[PDB]
Amino acid sequence: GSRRYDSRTTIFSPEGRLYQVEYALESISHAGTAIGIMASDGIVLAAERKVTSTLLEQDTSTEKLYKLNDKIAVAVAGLTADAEILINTARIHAQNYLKTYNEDIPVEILVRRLSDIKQGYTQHGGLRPFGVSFIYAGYDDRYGYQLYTSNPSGNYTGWKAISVGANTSAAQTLLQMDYKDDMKVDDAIELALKTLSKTTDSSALTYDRLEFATIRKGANDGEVYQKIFKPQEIKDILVKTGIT
Amino acid sequence: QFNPYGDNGGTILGIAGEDFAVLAGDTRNITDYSINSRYEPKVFDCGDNIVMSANGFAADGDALVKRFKNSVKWYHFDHNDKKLSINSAARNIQHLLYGKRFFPYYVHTII
């Protein structure tokens, strides 16, 4: 029969752990580091591009920062292709919500739905889980700025500052060291770059190896704006923050 | 257009005595103004001391009586040859008929 070749991707270990989830997490741990920092006036998403070449087109590239809504975005750590599958369904769920209630979807509701999808691949179906971890940066009129994280297990949590991917241990310790509740978006942007800068497995931290995004409520307006920095924009902020 | 129903005439009568009961019926089967048969039994012995007749549209009457007899057979198979009481047959027949509530057996049945 077929049973012979079934890996059984959804069983418990004698210790009560989920093999595939643990292995997927192990996979994620080798992915480019992504960081999320929540400030009083905004949110920052920063990510290190794993592997790069002189010939890689960076102007037309995006492998870690994706817009889900006009008020929600995510940073990806893991299999890009798996991420895109989830990203797309997330984009649809947001629209369904909007059409149903004529209100943008609350950040947690969208995060919970995506995590629930992940949880599924964990309990039934016999399929491998998605080798992906997300850092969600969004805003809604009930909780304002929010920062979430979800991993292969389908579990999610809220943060003031957090990281996913490689060297999270080191990154977390550094963030837990310099983060302060009254921080400002600009302070946060600097903290993010500094943190990545000290955790990079690479020589130096150049602009061609970074993706940056911020969700701020531009004072001169009254609405929420998402800014996915352009190569030159990252290059700029890199010099200013004193990393040249 | 096609009419799934027909009328074969006939009249049946059931009278319950104190310790007996009779179920009678003429033996004439018709179609419009023609006689199909002067002798076509319409009242049947269904076992377990139960007699039944489903009058009206003969094709429907036959189907029903046939389905009921088969019900008695399986009642025995499924309940250690227990005898099907007349009241139990009656309830059973109700379900047989109601099963076709939206495409009825065009008959007036009496047991």
Partner: protein
């Protein structure tokens, strides 16, 4: 059809709905409350096809209460009305459509303003100062067009409705057996037990 009326004043929404339930030749009940509370600050009145009417109302009520529990939050009146419109807009193209018309009166605690939504069985939604379904609008809209003011007090709104009901009781052929009136404001939903002679 039954009388379904609604008016949005300064700080509340008022819904008036006939109490009679007529089946054929007889008036079976004269104390029918054609309303369902969808949430502490949202009320929905309805009129239409015999069984569909309550089945729809209770179905919507169940869904809103479920959302409230899941999110530990109360959806805005506008959000609730869009959900209801979509449900009706689906139904209209289904095997057997819900023949139900509704008025949704809610007090938005975030905006601190009352809101009245009119939605027919086709999923046709509109927001208004006052509205109705059926023939009700035919007898009352000329009165509302005249005496309505955005700054009316709840008491003024009740007086205007009373006038509307009187016109209905004079010119309408059917005896709808009066109306049950309910107020929806910042403090919730309450019923005016005294309109039989206010």
């Amino acid at each position: 059809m039954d009388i379904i009326l609604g008016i949005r004043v300064q700080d509340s929404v008022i819904l008036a709905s006939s109490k009679a339930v007529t089946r054929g030749i007889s008036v079976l009940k004269d104390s029918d409350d054609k309303t369902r509370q969808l949430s502490p600050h949202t009320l929905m009145s309805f009129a239409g096809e015999a069984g569909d009417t309550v089945q729809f109302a209770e179905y919507i009520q169940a869904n809103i209460q479920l959302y409230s529990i899941r999110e530990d939050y109360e959806l805005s009146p506008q959000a609730v009305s869009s959900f209801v419109r979509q449900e009706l807009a689906k139904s209209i193209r289904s095997r057997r459509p819900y023949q139900v018309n509704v008025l949704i009166g809610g007090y938005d605690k975030k905006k601190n303003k009352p809101e009245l939504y009119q939605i027919d069985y086709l999923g046709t939604k509109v927001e208004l100062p006052y509205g109705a379904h059926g023939y009700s609008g035919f007898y009352t809209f000329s009165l509302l067009d005249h005496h309505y003011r955005p700054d009316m007090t709840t008491e003024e709104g009740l007086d205007l409705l009373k006038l509307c009901v009187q016109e209905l009781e004079k010119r309408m052929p059917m005896d709808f057996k009066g109306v049950i009136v309910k107020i929806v404001d910042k403090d919730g939903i309450r019923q005016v037990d005294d309109f039989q002679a206010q």
